[PDB]
Amino acid sequence: MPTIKEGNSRELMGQQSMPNRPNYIAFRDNFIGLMYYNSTGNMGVLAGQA
Amino acid sequence: IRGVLDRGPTFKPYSGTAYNALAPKGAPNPCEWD
Amino acid sequence: MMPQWSYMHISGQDASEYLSPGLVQFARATETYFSLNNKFRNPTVAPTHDVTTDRSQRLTLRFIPVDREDTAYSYKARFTLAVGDNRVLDMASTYFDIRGVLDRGPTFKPYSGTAYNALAPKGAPNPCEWDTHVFGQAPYSGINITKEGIQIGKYADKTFQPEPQIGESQWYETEINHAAGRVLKKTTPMKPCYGSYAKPTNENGGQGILVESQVEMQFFSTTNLTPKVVLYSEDVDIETPDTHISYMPTIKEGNSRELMGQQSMPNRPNYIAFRDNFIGLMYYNSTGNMGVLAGQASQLNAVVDLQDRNTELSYQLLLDSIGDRTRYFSMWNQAVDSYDPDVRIIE
Amino acid sequence: GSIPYLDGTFYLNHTFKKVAITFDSSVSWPGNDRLLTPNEFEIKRSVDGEGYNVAQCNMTKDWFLVQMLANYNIGYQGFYIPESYKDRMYSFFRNFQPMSRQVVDDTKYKDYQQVGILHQHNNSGFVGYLAPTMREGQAYPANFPYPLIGKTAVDSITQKKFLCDRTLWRIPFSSNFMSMGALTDLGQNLLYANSAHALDMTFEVDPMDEPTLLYVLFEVFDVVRVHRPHRGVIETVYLRTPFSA
Amino acid sequence: RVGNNFAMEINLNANLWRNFLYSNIALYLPDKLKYSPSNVKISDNPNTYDYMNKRVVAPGLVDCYINLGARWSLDYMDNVNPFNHHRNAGLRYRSMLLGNGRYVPFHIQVPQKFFAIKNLLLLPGSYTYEWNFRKDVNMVLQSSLGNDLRVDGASIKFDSICLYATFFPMAHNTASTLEAMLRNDTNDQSFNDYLSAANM
Amino acid sequence: RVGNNFAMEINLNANLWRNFLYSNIALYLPDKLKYSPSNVKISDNPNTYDYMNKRVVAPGLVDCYINLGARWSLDYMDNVNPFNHHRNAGLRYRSMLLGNGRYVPFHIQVPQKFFAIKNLLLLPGSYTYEWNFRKDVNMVLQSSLGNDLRVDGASIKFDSICLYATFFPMAHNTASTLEAMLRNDTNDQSFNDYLSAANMLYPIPANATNVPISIPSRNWAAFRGWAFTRLKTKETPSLGSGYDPYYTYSGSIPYLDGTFYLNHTFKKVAITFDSSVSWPGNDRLLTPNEFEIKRSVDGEGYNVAQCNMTKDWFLVQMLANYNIGYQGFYIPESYKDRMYSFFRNFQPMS
Amino acid sequence: NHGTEDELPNYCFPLGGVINTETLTKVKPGWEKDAFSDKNEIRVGNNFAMEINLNANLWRNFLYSNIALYLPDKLKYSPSNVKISDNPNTYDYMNKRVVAPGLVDCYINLGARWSLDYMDNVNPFNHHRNAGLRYRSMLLGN
Amino acid sequence: KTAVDSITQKKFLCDRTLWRIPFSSNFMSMGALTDLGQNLLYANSAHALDMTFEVDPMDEPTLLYVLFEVFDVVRVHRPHRGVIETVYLRTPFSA
Amino acid sequence: GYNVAQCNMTKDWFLVQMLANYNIGYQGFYIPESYKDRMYSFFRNFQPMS
Amino acid sequence: MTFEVDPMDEPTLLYVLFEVFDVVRVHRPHRGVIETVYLRTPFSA
């Protein structure tokens, strides 16, 4: 940025552009985190109705 | 499971640009000023 | 102990013994199409007696040489390898720990290219002076040029200012009226920019030789008289530790317009190190420098070598047969010699 | 980002200095004069203890021995590359990377000069200043870095270290550190069954300018027995020892 | 044209090498080695993408002449999570699995990992199977920069969850026989957790 | 701006390819193809780095249009040690193991290789263990250029050498019992050298083409067979002594390391017992009187695998290495085809 | 398509490292001319430079060479003022038909792992990057 | 369409390996101790051996390296504390 | 809903192919052992895209 | 422990001696054999 001054000017002709940092986003390996485990408050359940 | 996901605005699955990649990084677009 | 252990299968019988016979049979018969193996645990219990000592005992011992003899082209080391009572030693578990100093010499160059001005064209020259002409650059744009040099706020510190690293930020013509640069005196041999190096003489990066800074400004103008440019001339300890001249325009000493055309080229890469598996370090198959392994009580040498034998190679071939020579193992300098297939055979 | 605690993307194993294990406030484990430095597990040594190091890095002979045995039972009959099927992704060896390099000796190189980025020049006139921007400056003999090679190489100093990512440091509760069964020899010793013991551990780590955690896994038996006596009836018996829940 | 032609020089190889260093190492350098840009608005939140993306870093930090001829990891990078990177093949692939776009309708299959039930052979009867799923983006999602997805606008909504189960079309007489056997305590199933440890 | 912009053209790909050829092949070309630079001082010693570094080579020798569309090794480079190169990963790694600097304080662990003691289980007692270590840089060190390290300033000094030994903390009763058993001759340990061979070297004068060898009548019981290669005298230090004054080379040493690279220079082999009997004789081979390694055009028909190797030879090598040959030819199982094996290293070209 | 690592700019410079020098005269200190020579060349400001995106270029060349040219004929067009065979099963034909690089440019399906829907039904084996065929070809010679 | 009259060249490389000629009746590996090596004709008497190698010419001194495959063995005896006795046997080609 | 593996393939089909090629399917889905997953095999050649 | 001291215009040190038993037991079973047993309590090394 050649100037913190708004509006188009000969000055801005010298501004330089640079690509944004790559940023991958996705679900985790083996869906880690999706299901709760080892948490007393959100404990899974497997029981015979009987 | 089926649902919807919005990776948000910070998601950028690549390096570099998709626009005017061959243009020198300081070269300007044909413009006009006061 | 006991109870919970057997019940939980932490110990005790194997599934084959604890499960009912019908099930075992069934399991064996269904195996290829429907497996039950992973739903029954099989305990693994380590032995509790007659394996290890309860007594105090070192796992590793270190022996100091009893006699040493540092000679012209060799080194002899003698030890008293002692195997205590109630002990056994597997020779494969022995090795000579060595400490020393090594100078790879001046021809060692662990890389290709240069470490200095790699981006500079191979023929481009450093701003210089000769017999007196000048060929330079003034990238620094100052406020004004006085007899005190170039104003930067507050004149510049000759020892390091201006800094060659600094130039103008824009890409277009701004029109610099008060320019400053850095230049080498005709007393500093000419060398291409590429590969050019000169040790700094001050915490600020200045490389000006100290006598005692000897920097001297030189003012310049075009064709009322007012210097448009000023250069900070100096003598540096110019070197070219990793490149050489690819093009000498004249076998004539001294700086000249001629030398402006010399070309620089990186020196050939040259790796130097110990050999694969420390080959060569120890003597083998040499009657004159024969190893020794003898009982102090027998004094008879268990080692009997021949010039006819090839221990080093034998070991090379032995390794290949028992593992993947492609893997590296720092401990023994186990890193096989290879080459790029694309280099040996051009495709 | 990655969550090592859950995914195994471990990367801070090289920061451990040593480990001292003590039972009942007085007894040193494993004691028995086993290790070169019997009173504790020394993971790495700094220059002063070079002689006790191995593999061309700052790791100690003692530690290398324990890790090799614990992971592959290799150690008493020579050291060699473990068989590939035993050397997995999260294994010791496969992840072990010893490194070395040389740097100017600031205290012995007569002409030494401490020059920072602000004043370093190399490629001046062809590169942007303190940024990935447009070129600026002018051609000029570089003033950095110092030559470590050639007839002019500067007095240097050697640095050794190592990386050991995506693995866990191991100290088996086995008399010879070897794997002779899930249910170890020590784990079955009367001295550990006929009575209760207190345990003290002391870790020495490299300092980090940020809050960290020392993650300890106490290896035990975490088992379940499933009973299914009747239609729609599942009964379970959990047992975790040691460290019963 | 009298003489040689007009020519411009460039060091291809040096350039490439440089670009690799700057892109892969420099930019991942710790924040402490970085500095804020002039005349450019930047977030106050360091856990932000804007922040990580605007902080500037000097290439001279990791230039082509860095530790020349050595096989050395930067002492600055040793304690930096190596996995949070654009060169993480695993994460890269998982990202592409979803697509190249911000907005994604998803369909996935999640496995049961709990050791006591993961390999269990369930006998006939009716069972209540219930589980909890996280909604926290910082937990369910992963980024290469490791920025704060909560602040950073990531979002996730669960539309439907089903339970699938496949059955070996076992012969009835056989299945029945196997059942009887598995109903005896002597033939009780048993499992242990692979990790087998108390975590502290 | 009226019209298109100002532009400069460059062939990126061609350039890269070129740079690769010049750097990796050209510069390694034999000295004979090189020439001295004008107005530039250069050493008189060809075994010198200065020399190897200053000799200039024309890129046109190995330019991007070299043997276009072919998979061919340069006929000039065939007899050039392929291991002496900056692209030798093994050597490169060992070099970096030490660091990137000239001056290095070192700490290493050296293994015992001698076959009679390397795996021996030593019983209780006190033993005298002594060994000799070389100091010769051309021997202990290795360079990619293979220059003369003696002349070239390499130096090495041994400060201290220790002996380490690890012991299984075996139960005393057990250890004692094992000892007793191992003390009986019936339980004597035994080892054999992996190589299992008597090694001989016979000189081949420059330009010589015939190499006759004679072995005075002797006993052959238990004889296993023959194995052979060809080495360069320059790359073979003399081992019949503690020091070789004429050894001015520091590259790979095939005789010791296995970096063999001259096997393609063999034409044929004739074996004869008692001045009259041809082995194997019996009318076994296509050219029964000898082992023909390769044929030149005139004998095409007897060649195989799309190269100049003979059917006979291919058959022998395949059998000898993998027992493959009587029941068809096929790629040997990977575990049998190792690093120093025949097939894995066989490269036919045209 | 993970893009390109083109963060740093790439430049090419003049052989002499400077080309737009301006003739100057040395001066002495209120100043007086010096007579050093009457004509010294000094470059005032930065050097002359040309920019190029190395990485983007390489990536492009790869796309055009490996995918574009293999695109189906239907996406192609005949060149102007250039004789071309009538036989589509001909080499001349396949070699002259022209294809627009914009079809498979560096910004194609950015950030995705996707095979072109156009190429799915195109025999993947008929290609210069078929190692097996390449090797068999070289086995015979060049 | 303009290619010049050509000629074909074939060769081969076979680096980092040793040429082999086993002393076996069918060249196969049927045991360390070969069938021929145990033939009465090679035991009941001594024989002289002549070998003739033909190689490509090289403008530099070289060496023909021959490995005579045999048995290179040792038997270790340890009758008493601090006593190591060995028996070396190399055949053929006894030292 | 009837699709699987993050592509347009059906659960049914994925099941049949896995069983037919490696007998994998009734006791969970997992990557087949390399020696069973050859050049012309199902899994090794399966590429789901989005 | 909390110490209160007079202020000094220079960096100083508070030197604390933790009184314990620092002992050794020497065993000399055979010719040229010295075995030792060190024990420091409290504050074991």
mmCIF file of all heavy atoms in Angstrom, chain F residues 166-182:
data_model
loop_
_atom_site.group_PDB
_atom_site.id
_atom_site.type_symbol
_atom_site.label_atom_id
_atom_site.label_comp_id
_atom_site.label_asym_id
_atom_site.label_seq_id
_atom_site.Cartn_x
_atom_site.Cartn_y
_atom_site.Cartn_z
ATOM 1 N N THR F 166 27.142 -54.426 25.297
ATOM 2 C CA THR F 166 25.867 -54.541 25.983
ATOM 3 C C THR F 166 25.603 -55.974 26.394
ATOM 4 O O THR F 166 25.891 -56.900 25.635
ATOM 5 C CB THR F 166 24.708 -54.001 25.137
ATOM 6 O OG1 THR F 166 25.032 -52.701 24.693
ATOM 7 C CG2 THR F 166 23.434 -53.976 25.971
ATOM 8 N N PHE F 167 25.059 -56.169 27.585
ATOM 9 C CA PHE F 167 24.799 -57.518 28.047
ATOM 10 C C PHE F 167 23.362 -57.791 28.437
ATOM 11 O O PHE F 167 22.739 -57.029 29.170
ATOM 12 C CB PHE F 167 25.671 -57.918 29.261
ATOM 13 C CG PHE F 167 27.170 -57.850 29.105
ATOM 14 C CD1 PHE F 167 27.826 -56.632 28.946
ATOM 15 C CD2 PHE F 167 27.939 -59.010 29.183
ATOM 16 C CE1 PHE F 167 29.215 -56.558 28.840
ATOM 17 C CE2 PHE F 167 29.329 -58.963 29.076
ATOM 18 C CZ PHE F 167 29.965 -57.731 28.906
ATOM 19 N N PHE F 168 22.859 -58.923 27.964
ATOM 20 C CA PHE F 168 21.524 -59.333 28.327
ATOM 21 C C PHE F 168 21.630 -59.623 29.819
ATOM 22 O O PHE F 168 22.538 -60.338 30.241
ATOM 23 C CB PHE F 168 21.108 -60.594 27.530
ATOM 24 C CG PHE F 168 19.676 -61.019 27.745
ATOM 25 C CD1 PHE F 168 18.674 -60.646 26.846
ATOM 26 C CD2 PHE F 168 19.326 -61.827 28.820
ATOM 27 C CE1 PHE F 168 17.348 -61.030 27.039
ATOM 28 C CE2 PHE F 168 18.006 -62.236 29.029
ATOM 29 C CZ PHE F 168 17.017 -61.832 28.134
ATOM 30 N N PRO F 169 20.756 -59.041 30.640
ATOM 31 C CA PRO F 169 20.839 -59.251 32.075
ATOM 32 C C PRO F 169 20.282 -60.612 32.460
ATOM 33 O O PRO F 169 19.402 -60.729 33.312
ATOM 34 C CB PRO F 169 19.927 -58.193 32.689
ATOM 35 C CG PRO F 169 18.945 -57.800 31.591
ATOM 36 C CD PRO F 169 19.509 -58.327 30.278
ATOM 37 N N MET F 170 20.810 -61.627 31.805
ATOM 38 C CA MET F 170 20.394 -63.001 31.999
ATOM 39 C C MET F 170 20.476 -63.506 33.429
ATOM 40 O O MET F 170 21.389 -63.179 34.181
ATOM 41 C CB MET F 170 21.201 -63.916 31.070
ATOM 42 C CG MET F 170 20.703 -65.341 31.067
ATOM 43 S SD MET F 170 21.645 -66.374 29.917
ATOM 44 C CE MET F 170 21.192 -65.609 28.344
ATOM 45 N N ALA F 171 19.497 -64.339 33.787
ATOM 46 C CA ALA F 171 19.470 -64.927 35.108
ATOM 47 C C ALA F 171 20.770 -65.676 35.307
ATOM 48 O O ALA F 171 21.266 -66.346 34.396
ATOM 49 C CB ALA F 171 18.261 -65.832 35.280
ATOM 50 N N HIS F 172 21.348 -65.538 36.497
ATOM 51 C CA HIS F 172 22.608 -66.177 36.801
ATOM 52 C C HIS F 172 22.620 -67.693 36.686
ATOM 53 O O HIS F 172 23.568 -68.271 36.153
ATOM 54 C CB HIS F 172 23.219 -65.671 38.113
ATOM 55 C CG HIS F 172 23.660 -64.240 38.013
ATOM 56 N ND1 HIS F 172 24.405 -63.631 39.008
ATOM 57 C CD2 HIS F 172 23.448 -63.328 37.027
ATOM 58 C CE1 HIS F 172 24.631 -62.382 38.609
ATOM 59 N NE2 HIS F 172 24.066 -62.170 37.425
ATOM 60 N N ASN F 173 21.574 -68.345 37.174
ATOM 61 C CA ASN F 173 21.516 -69.794 37.087
ATOM 62 C C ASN F 173 21.505 -70.219 35.632
ATOM 63 O O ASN F 173 22.224 -71.133 35.227
ATOM 64 C CB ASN F 173 20.323 -70.386 37.860
ATOM 65 C CG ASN F 173 19.009 -69.687 37.573
ATOM 66 O OD1 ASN F 173 18.940 -68.452 37.518
ATOM 67 N ND2 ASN F 173 17.960 -70.482 37.395
ATOM 68 N N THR F 174 20.678 -69.525 34.860
ATOM 69 C CA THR F 174 20.525 -69.769 33.441
ATOM 70 C C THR F 174 21.825 -69.542 32.687
ATOM 71 O O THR F 174 22.280 -70.401 31.931
ATOM 72 C CB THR F 174 19.414 -68.890 32.852
ATOM 73 O OG1 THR F 174 18.226 -69.043 33.604
ATOM 74 C CG2 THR F 174 19.172 -69.277 31.403
ATOM 75 N N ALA F 175 22.393 -68.354 32.866
ATOM 76 C CA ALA F 175 23.636 -68.002 32.215
ATOM 77 C C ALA F 175 24.691 -69.061 32.487
ATOM 78 O O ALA F 175 25.395 -69.518 31.590
ATOM 79 C CB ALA F 175 24.123 -66.639 32.672
ATOM 80 N N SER F 176 24.787 -69.443 33.756
ATOM 81 C CA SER F 176 25.740 -70.443 34.194
ATOM 82 C C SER F 176 25.528 -71.770 33.492
ATOM 83 O O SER F 176 26.479 -72.452 33.109
ATOM 84 C CB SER F 176 25.725 -70.626 35.700
ATOM 85 O OG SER F 176 25.873 -71.998 36.003
ATOM 86 N N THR F 177 24.260 -72.136 33.329
ATOM 87 C CA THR F 177 23.903 -73.378 32.672
ATOM 88 C C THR F 177 24.254 -73.350 31.192
ATOM 89 O O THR F 177 24.779 -74.311 30.629
ATOM 90 C CB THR F 177 22.419 -73.740 32.868
ATOM 91 O OG1 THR F 177 22.202 -74.199 34.193
ATOM 92 C CG2 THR F 177 22.003 -74.818 31.872
ATOM 93 N N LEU F 178 23.960 -72.215 30.567
ATOM 94 C CA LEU F 178 24.244 -72.029 29.162
ATOM 95 C C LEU F 178 25.741 -72.104 28.910
ATOM 96 O O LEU F 178 26.193 -72.611 27.888
ATOM 97 C CB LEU F 178 23.633 -70.725 28.620
ATOM 98 C CG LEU F 178 24.104 -70.378 27.217
ATOM 99 C CD1 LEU F 178 23.322 -71.193 26.202
ATOM 100 C CD2 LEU F 178 23.890 -68.887 26.963
ATOM 101 N N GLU F 179 26.503 -71.598 29.872
ATOM 102 C CA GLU F 179 27.953 -71.594 29.798
ATOM 103 C C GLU F 179 28.503 -73.003 29.723
ATOM 104 O O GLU F 179 29.260 -73.357 28.822
ATOM 105 C CB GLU F 179 28.562 -70.846 30.999
ATOM 106 C CG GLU F 179 30.098 -70.813 30.974
ATOM 107 C CD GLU F 179 30.688 -70.196 32.210
ATOM 108 O OE1 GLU F 179 30.034 -69.938 33.203
ATOM 109 O OE2 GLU F 179 31.973 -69.957 32.095
ATOM 110 N N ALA F 180 28.088 -73.806 30.704
ATOM 111 C CA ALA F 180 28.492 -75.193 30.808
ATOM 112 C C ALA F 180 28.298 -75.938 29.498
ATOM 113 O O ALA F 180 29.188 -76.656 29.041
ATOM 114 C CB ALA F 180 27.724 -75.875 31.928
ATOM 115 N N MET F 181 27.129 -75.744 28.896
ATOM 116 C CA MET F 181 26.789 -76.384 27.640
ATOM 117 C C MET F 181 27.698 -75.946 26.502
ATOM 118 O O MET F 181 28.204 -76.768 25.742
ATOM 119 C CB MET F 181 25.330 -76.119 27.251
ATOM 120 C CG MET F 181 24.329 -76.799 28.167
ATOM 121 S SD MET F 181 22.623 -76.448 27.676
ATOM 122 C CE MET F 181 21.779 -77.884 28.384
ATOM 123 N N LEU F 182 27.874 -74.635 26.396
ATOM 124 C CA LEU F 182 28.694 -74.059 25.348
ATOM 125 C C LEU F 182 30.170 -74.379 25.496
ATOM 126 O O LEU F 182 30.964 -74.101 24.598
ATOM 127 C CB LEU F 182 28.476 -72.540 25.224
ATOM 128 C CG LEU F 182 27.069 -72.190 24.766
ATOM 129 C CD1 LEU F 182 26.906 -70.676 24.645
ATOM 130 C CD2 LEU F 182 26.789 -72.856 23.424
#
